[PDB]
Write a protein that binds this ligand. Structure first.
Ligand SMILES: *[C@@H]1O[C@H](CO[C@H]2O[C@@H](C)[C@@H](O)[C@@H](O)[C@@H]2O)[C@@H](O[C@@H]2O[C@H](CO)[C@@H](O[C@@H]3O[C@H](CO[C@H]4O[C@H](CO)[C@@H](O)[C@H](O)[C@@H]4O)[C@@H](O)[C@H](O[C@H]4O[C@H](CO)[C@@H](O)[C@H](O)[C@@H]4O)[C@@H]3O)[C@H](O)[C@H]2NC(C)=O)[C@H](O)[C@H]1NC(C)=O
Ligand SMILES: CC(=O)N[C@@H]1[C@@H](OC2O[C@@H](C)[C@@H](O)[C@@H](O)[C@@H]2O)[C@H](O[C@@H]2O[C@H](CO)[C@H](O)[C@H](O[C@]3(C(=O)O)C[C@H](O)[C@@H](NC(C)=O)[C@H]([C@H](O)[C@H](O)CO)O3)[C@H]2O)[C@@H](COS(=O)(=O)O)O[C@H]1O
Ligand SMILES: CC(=O)N[C@@H]1[C@@H](O[C@@H]2O[C@@H](C)[C@@H](O)[C@@H](O)[C@@H]2O)[C@H](O[C@@H]2O[C@H](CO)[C@H](O)[C@H](O[C@]3(C(=O)O)C[C@H](O)[C@@H](NC(C)=O)[C@H]([C@H](O)[C@H](O)CO)O3)[C@H]2O)[C@@H](COS(=O)(=O)O)O[C@H]1O
Ligand SMILES: CC(=O)N[C@@H]1[C@@H](O[C@H]2O[C@@H](C)[C@@H](O)[C@@H](O)[C@@H]2O)[C@H](O[C@@H]2O[C@H](CO)[C@H](O)[C@H](O[C@]3(C(=O)O)C[C@H](O)[C@@H](NC(C)=O)[C@H]([C@H](O)[C@H](O)CO)O3)[C@H]2O)[C@@H](COS(=O)(=O)O)O[C@H]1O
Ligand SMILES: *[C@@H]1O[C@H](CO)[C@@H](O[C@@H]2O[C@H](CO)[C@@H](O[C@@H]3O[C@H](CO[C@H]4O[C@H](CO)[C@@H](O)[C@H](O)[C@@H]4O)[C@@H](O)[C@H](O)[C@@H]3O)[C@H](O)[C@H]2NC(C)=O)[C@H](O)[C@H]1NC(C)=O
Ligand SMILES: *[C@@H]1O[C@H](CO)[C@@H](O[C@@H]2O[C@H](CO)[C@@H](O[C@@H]3O[C@H](CO)[C@@H](O)[C@H](O)[C@@H]3O)[C@H](O)[C@H]2NC(C)=O)[C@H](O)[C@H]1NC(C)=O
Ligand SMILES: *[C@@H]1O[C@H](CO[C@H]2O[C@@H](C)[C@@H](O)[C@@H](O)[C@@H]2O)[C@@H](O[C@@H]2O[C@H](CO)[C@@H](O)[C@H](O)[C@H]2NC(C)=O)[C@H](O)[C@H]1NC(C)=O
Ligand SMILES: *[C@@H]1O[C@H](CO)[C@@H](O[C@@H]2O[C@H](CO)[C@@H](O)[C@H](O)[C@H]2NC(C)=O)[C@H](O)[C@H]1NC(C)=O
Ligand SMILES: *[C@@H]1O[C@H](CO)[C@@H](O[C@@H]2O[C@H](CO)[C@@H](O)[C@H](O)[C@H]2NC(C)=O)[C@H](O)[C@H]1NC(C)=O
Ligand SMILES: *[C@H]1O[C@H](CO)[C@@H](O[C@@H]2O[C@H](CO)[C@@H](O)[C@H](O)[C@H]2NC(C)=O)[C@H](O)[C@H]1NC(C)=O
Ligand SMILES: *[C@@H]1O[C@H](CO[C@H]2O[C@@H](C)[C@@H](O)[C@@H](O)[C@@H]2O)[C@@H](O)[C@H](O)[C@H]1NC(C)=O
Ligand SMILES: *[C@@H]1O[C@H](CO)[C@@H](O)[C@H](O)[C@H]1NC(C)=O
Ligand SMILES: *[C@@H]1O[C@H](CO)[C@@H](O)[C@H](O)[C@H]1NC(C)=O
Ligand SMILES: *[C@@H]1O[C@H](CO)[C@@H](O)[C@H](O)[C@H]1NC(C)=O
Ligand SMILES: *[C@@H]1O[C@H](CO)[C@@H](O)[C@H](O)[C@H]1NC(C)=O
Ligand SMILES: *[C@@H]1O[C@H](CO)[C@@H](O)[C@H](O)[C@H]1NC(C)=O
Lengths: 318, 172, 330, 172, 173, 317
């Protein structure tokens, strides 16, 4: 036969895979590729970033110097990890705007501390308590100095400390509220105390608050932690006549790329540049459906758990 | 698709064609045969790999942000903290749902276009020596051996050589 | 030969074409700001039903009362005493009618209560030894008798003593307790001593975690229903296993018990629209709206299953081909 | 339109075609007629319906959020609440303006594309028995009564029956 | 090119055509010639200008807003103010990245389309009087002078005038 | 007796590369830039009303710092604060400083009206060497520093009803002495107190005796506060010591005005967008100059360049 036929066509596969389009909800194509990371490794990979396990401690307890959190004296981190099973085992306290202090330290990424020879004349220093047992003795938060009366009376303190550096000094202090007036006078002499921490651009006054609170370890009283930031060229001043839980020194504040993250997953050796509470995840896909809380180089969280991008033509078998 | 070739005037795909995406099947004086077209196949793959490059391994680096889970009931500024994060998630969820939808729609259309581009390319080579049977098949009105088919695949087919023969078969 | 409707006996004409309509409608595209198509459908919801539909979500009309005045127990809000809601509606013509007060961080409490979606209250028999209970005022009349917020207990001196009040209350329930308490600021020192003996009051509500301390603030204020004095509301939350303690040597407006906090999908909305028997899964201050369209221009404030608010009052999606009329001239 | 059929090589639409979106008009030995094409029509409608399924009756449930109107002035934290809602609205407004614009460009194209599909489909049937007159019309080069036109519309027109007659009328 | 005209079956563009985007080049009894097709050129330009007018200056008017740089460290609410502006900027950065990418793909496809439109338009006029040589050129099988070529360009070419002469040349040898 | 007709398209000598969905680089005949990334260098003053703060911040201009007296009844669309601005009156601090700065900036006006607050039994117009007006001791102009008259300081009880159609902004303060000697010297009462209240809201502030560091020869401080008062309401002020009194109100407005930090020069030109870097044109949809902006501005994005094709694919020989 002196004629021929030349047919044109395309490929196909036994069973393809279904995708979304503008005009179809589902439609078969030869192949696809998943763009939503649904599943993590299980562990938090401590390789690309410097992950620091908190174990029994919070970041705040580590800063203040809880006897069991002494491990973290001068430690740093890209990501601090807080376990649900952590606790405080020192003198009971609170912090107004707690979250903010916690955020500021985590961001700085370091508990670099430098003590300073403050002069507390007319008062007995280094007060401790049974609720904060260190080793086997009545101690206190390592970064705070509990000031009490010196026999006869408790004078109006007036102490200064200028910032000579060119970075921000972070100061941590507080005030003591007793459970009774008979206690208030026993330790601080005066009927009502006061703490006035001021800079050349700012100030904060806290008045103590006598009256009993619930029983924590055996103590009825409390301590409220405050903080202050002194800028370059500026000067600190502390003026108290009672109840001052004084500072020992300052923390270094670095504008950093650090953070803190609550998790109970195993920290372990592996490759990854993205970290979640569920564990590390691979960041090859543009999106993820594991956990909105993330740190590092991460796919963006969305609500969908799957999206197939078509990498082939329409599939039409025979 | 939009050119109406794939899942259109070509009835179905070939599972037997496993060495290429588009190609030819032909019978002649020497019998049947199959052969892939690398140029058309590769044009489609490059475009699909092109999309993959915009999507795969394009990832923003982020560090300390805002807290997204809360133990205590706080009110005003917690309400905001959540709403912010909720707004963000919805918008990215939409950006993702739309991206996939458009890219897939487009993928189908471009793969369909390459099919058609190859058909129109072949049609032009043959010129007056063949007719469009339908189903994307040509009746070549002359003896066209394997070597002859090869030139059609190679793009080197000279239509003048067989013109007088085929043209004579087409009308008589 | 001219009107012949047939062809010349050995040929024919086969014309291909598409439909068209006499009145098309304009849409927007990538390349055209206005382009006529055969048909389109509105994607922006800009019409309201006019009233709030109360058969989908449980809608509670607050009438003359705010959510806070309902909670506290302002006398004219006694109806709302034990009540739940998906959406609490606050009216513009609402008002307060009890003792004059202020709530530092008012908005937060209002939100917290709204989300919980309930004013279910449980009285606890607090022991207040050495003080006169159930204080009242002519600024908060229940009937033709002086009275007070039904959920608060104004404490005053008894005889010659305002003792140091020291009371606890352990949360043994499996949910978070919400406590509303306060403090009285009298208008002069004569009054501070007349009511509380001590020259200088103090209130300290505390948990095992947190604490709050407030001092009264003596000095006159503008008249509100005949009273220069003022009260300030504060709130505390106690968790299962935790304990409440209240210490005060003066000016305490004690709590009568707790509110039960739920994790809820409820809320509050400022609206003057009528509520009525209709069908709609989306509520706005202007009234309910339908949710068949993906967007809306009625109101940015919404509750329920709603289209997403945009600035555009209309967006037409084409549901037909380009319109190309037959008659240039009609 | 991307294929240049609708508002292109086809001068205009038919306002009397009420039972279809696409169709034929013929003039033969029995008179002048009209008739819709249900397949092509349904292809266009179905896609359009496909888009409506994605956009219509598709809404999220939302509950308590942030306040968006204010009685007093409060500075920083209200500036922030406003900016958030103002930012969210602008972003959703952009998404809507763009969704429509895209879909509409595509609606006009896929309809134009279906008009072209029918013409090509019909061209293939008629084969050597007709010629493109332009304007969307074929001149058939043989007597083709109403039945014969039906066979084209039915998709059952065997061109071999009239081929010899037709070739003669085209060339002579 | 989704039709495969520009950068497809048409091998390259003409730098020598400077008064139009599309057009003709021809060879006949009177020499060789070139003319731009005003109509197809204008179709693309109009479409491209539509896009320009969509994007170009449609800017909002913003006034007072939130702060975005800070001296003192502060914590929670400054963290929020930063996260919000960062979130906003990232989304608008996505929008601009996609916007440009979609438009350009479309701009290429629509220009490719006007080319193929012009070809098909011309093919339909010529009918049985010419064949497709490939490379976007027709072979007209009659004496087609500059006026004849002009009629093709005008869309007033009447194929019946040359049909006999043409059918006669195509089917020969 | 044959002819050849060829259909084609133009090309250019030097096209320009653009991104597509399929190609990272593909050449087209022309393009247009969508990211505005260069600024004019200076802020243009013809389009909007730009106001140079010079040596004054917004807050110091309001309070009436002597060297800021030029900004008295001023108004603006945008108020420019310079990095070299300094405070030169009595040392102060403002809890929630940013909020008051924002509120005034939005109102866009320092239209101050003085009122006849009746203060009896006190000496008014206290001043300081830290706040000199000419060679004489002075104070913030919009504030009134009260001290004891004769040998006492009464429990001050003053009202002022807002019978107007707008919100009144009241700036007031409290003085914190450096010792109990100074507390009892100026105000007699050993313990000061300031209560500012409406029918709706109230604020009480206790002073805090104690030495702070020297500022212009003074170790004392004032803390500034504000109270907004609505139409039909009534401002009351009750204090037995340390009150730094108001002199009247600022008229609040819902306005389209703002405040910006910039060290850019401000000169005659035209532009509807302002940034800290200078004004920029707004012909492009996007920009990469600064995220801080005022006016009709392109939207800020990360990318410094985005080229939109304005022509076909460029294919030369
Ligand atoms: C595109 O345009 C179509 C053409 O319609 C029109 O004809 C052109 C030439 C102009 O003259 C126009 O003025 C005219 O509208 C539109 O079709 C028409 O659509 C309208 C509504 O948009 C219909 O209105 C309805 O008319 C019903 C009665 O129809 C008959 O009588 C009227 C005159 O009264 C004529 O227009 C018609 O030709 C018929 O002869 C009427 O029953 C409807 O109201 C009912 O409901 C109310 C309650 O609200 C009740 O009180 C009342 O008793 C009625 O029972 C209504 O008024 C119109 O009929 C319809 N006409 C035709 C011929 O189809 C089409 O809408 C439009 N498309 C778009 C997308 O806009
Ligand atoms: C049965 C009885 O009442 N016995 C007396 C003891 O009272 C109590 O026992 C302890 C365990 C505690 O749970 C109390 O709540 C209980 O009533 C009393 O013990 C003390 O009582 C005082 C009263 O407030 C303190 O609680 C005191 O706490 C110390 C501590 O933390 O160990 C002592 C420590 O040096 C001191 N630190 C200082 C001054 O810097 C702190 C501090 O005062 C408080 O934390 C402030 O809030 O408290 C605790 O020892 C004993 C001892 O009395 S003594 O005057 O200290 O000698 O006396 C029993 O009669
Ligand atoms: C070495 C010594 O003792 N010299 C005193 C001198 O003390 C001091 O000098 C001044 C400049 C100041 O820096 C002090 O810190 C320094 O020790 C006396 O000068 C007065 O000191 C008092 C402090 O007791 C005030 O600073 C006062 O300054 C003013 C001021 O300029 O702001 C005077 C104003 O009239 C007054 N305004 C009022 C009451 O409305 C304010 C205000 O009292 C104060 O800012 C509240 O915090 O203070 C200095 O004039 C100097 C005179 O003392 S006086 O007889 O009491 O006036 O006597 C030297 O021997
Ligand atoms: C012209 C003249 O001097 N008339 C006085 C009364 O003066 C006043 O009139 C009353 C209605 C108020 O508007 C006062 O602000 C105004 O000065 C005066 O009336 C008494 O004034 C008291 C204030 O010092 C109280 O307001 C008192 O009423 C209550 C009240 O209804 O709220 C009475 C309540 O039992 C009491 N509740 C308590 C202690 O729990 C409260 C409470 O003291 C305040 O709310 C605390 O801030 O006040 C009102 O009757 C009387 C003085 O009488 S009295 O013996 O001192 O009580 O004398 C007229 O000649
Ligand atoms: C410090 O100053 C305060 C205000 O300057 C003093 O408060 C004033 O005290 C007097 C005497 O107790 C009150 O007098 C009462 O006024 C009410 C108000 O009614 C008004 O409206 C009705 C409308 O029909 C009208 O009829 C009245 O004339 C009033 O305009 C009357 O109902 C009572 O009968 C009574 O006369 C003032 O109301 C009150 N003024 C303000 C502005 O609050 C306060 O006594 C001073 N405190 C100290 C410690 O010195
Ligand atoms: C509590 O301690 C503070 C901190 O030292 C004391 O403040 C200081 O007061 C002295 C004068 O009494 C100031 O000295 C002055 O210094 C300036 C420097 O320019 C100089 O020009 C003067 O001639 C004078 O010598 C000193 O600056 C200031 N401390 C600072 C600014 O840090 C204060 O006296 C103490 N108060 C009490 C009640 O104990
Ligand atoms: C379309 O073109 C035809 C062809 O003739 C020419 O085309 C012109 C665009 C121009 O290049 C000219 O030099 C060339 O001759 C036109 O026909 C011509 O029409 C003119 C009057 O306008 C007459 O003078 C000529 O004799 C005539 N020539 C022929 C061979 O017919 C035609 O008018 C034009 N139509 C339209 C609508 O533009
Ligand atoms: C079909 O798509 C799959 C993925 O969906 C592809 O297989 C991957 O190929 C690349 C090689 O570079 C890698 O990501 C993985 O090794 C492969 N498997 C995965 C991701 O699961 C491949 O492109 C296609 N396979 C076919 C057609 O057989
Ligand atoms: C006031 O009462 C509280 C409790 O109601 C007392 O606190 C208790 O003190 C005893 C020791 O005497 C402890 O065993 C309990 O654990 C404490 N209970 C709680 C809940 O903390 C407190 O001692 C009293 N304080 C005053 C000042 O009266
Ligand atoms: C095209 O527009 C819409 C659909 O896109 C059609 O309007 C709806 O038609 C049906 C009734 O059969 C229902 O969905 C609604 O009742 C109609 N819409 C309303 C009432 O708003 C409309 O019929 C179509 N128009 C044309 C000319 O075909
Ligand atoms: C297709 O048509 C054949 C005859 O022509 C017809 O025209 C149609 C439009 C119809 O309405 C009738 O008038 C005639 O059937 C007929 O012999 C075939 O059976 C038809 N086949 C199919 C599948 O429809
Ligand atoms: C990661 O942490 C685990 C905790 O046990 C530890 O064993 C391992 O050495 C750590 N890896 C690195 C690289 O620090
Ligand atoms: C293509 O095939 C033909 C015949 O099979 C052969 O002559 C020619 O060399 C080939 N051309 C190319 C470019 O491979
Ligand atoms: C009609 O066709 C017949 C042949 O079937 C022919 O003889 C006659 O001349 C034709 N007339 C016309 C006008 O076409
Ligand atoms: C091409 O675009 C550029 C930049 O937008 C413009 O300056 C130039 O004049 C344009 N050229 C042409 C030929 O349109
Ligand atoms: C403008 O100002 C900011 C703020 O310092 C600077 O970092 C940025 O790089 C500048 N942008 C320019 C010159 O485009």
């Amino acid at each position: 036969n002196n004629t021929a036929t030349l047919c044109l066509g395309h490929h196909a596969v036994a069973n393809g895979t279904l995708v979304k389009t503008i005009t179809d909800d589902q439609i078969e194509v030869t192949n696809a590729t998943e763009l939503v990371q649904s599943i993590s490794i299980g562990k938090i990979c401590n390789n690309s970033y410097r992950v620091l396990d908190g174990r029994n401690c919070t970041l705040i307890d580590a800063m203040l110097g809880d006897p069991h959190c002494d491990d973290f004296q001068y430690e740093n981190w890209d990501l601090f990890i807080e376990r649900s099973s952590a606790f405080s085992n020192c003198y009971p306290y609170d912090i107004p705007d707690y979250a903010s202090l916690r955020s500021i330290v985590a961001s700085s990424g370091t508990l670099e501390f430098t003590a300073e020879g403050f002069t507390w004349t007319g008062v007995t220093q280094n007060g401790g308590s049974g609720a904060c047992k260190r080793g086997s003795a009545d101690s206190f938060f390592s970064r705070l100095n509990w000031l009490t009366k010196s026999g006869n009376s408790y004078p109006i303190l007036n102490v200064t400390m200028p910032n000579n550096k060119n970075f921000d000094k972070l100061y941590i202090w507080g005030i003591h509220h007793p459970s009774s007036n008979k206690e208030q006078t026993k330790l601080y002499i005066q009927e009502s105390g006061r703490v006035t921490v001021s800079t050349e651009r700012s100030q904060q006054t806290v008045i103590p608050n006598i009256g009993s609170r619930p029983w924590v370890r055996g103590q009825s009283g409390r301590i409220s932690i405050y903080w202050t930031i002194v800028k370059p060229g500026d000067i600190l001043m502390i003026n108290s006549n009672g109840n001052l839980v004084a500072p020992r020194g300052y923390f270094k504040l670095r504008t950093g790329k650090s953070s803190v993250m609550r998790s109970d997953a195993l920290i372990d050796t592996c490759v990854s540049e993205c970290i979640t509470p569920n564990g590390s995840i691979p960041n090859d896909k543009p999106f993820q459906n594991v956990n909105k809380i993330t740190y590092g180089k991460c796919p963006k969280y969305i609500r969908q758990n799957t999206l197939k991008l078509a990498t082939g033509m329409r599939n039409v078998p025979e | 698709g939009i050119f109406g070739a794939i899942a259109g005037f070509i009835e179905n795909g070939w599972e037997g064609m496993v060495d290429g995406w588009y190609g030819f099947r032909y019978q002649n004086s020497e019998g049947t045969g199959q052969a892939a077209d690398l140029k058309s196949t590769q044009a489609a793959i490059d475009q699909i790999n092109g999309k993959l490059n915009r999507v795969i391994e394009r990832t923003n680096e982020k560090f300390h942000q805002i807290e997204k889970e809360f133990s205590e009931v706080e009110g005003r500024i917690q309400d905001l903290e959540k709403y912010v994060e909720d707004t963000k998630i919805d918008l990215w969820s939409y950006n993702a749902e739309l991206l996939v939808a458009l890219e897939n729609q487009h993928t189908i259309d471009l793969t369909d276009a390459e099919m058609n581009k190859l058909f129109e390319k072949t049609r032009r080579q043959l010129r007056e020596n063949a007719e469009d049977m339908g189903g994307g098949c040509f009746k070549i009105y002359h003896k066209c051996d394997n070597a002859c088919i090869g030139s059609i695949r190679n793009g080197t087919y000279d239509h003048y050589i067989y013109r007088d023969e085929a043209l004579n078969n087409r009308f008589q």
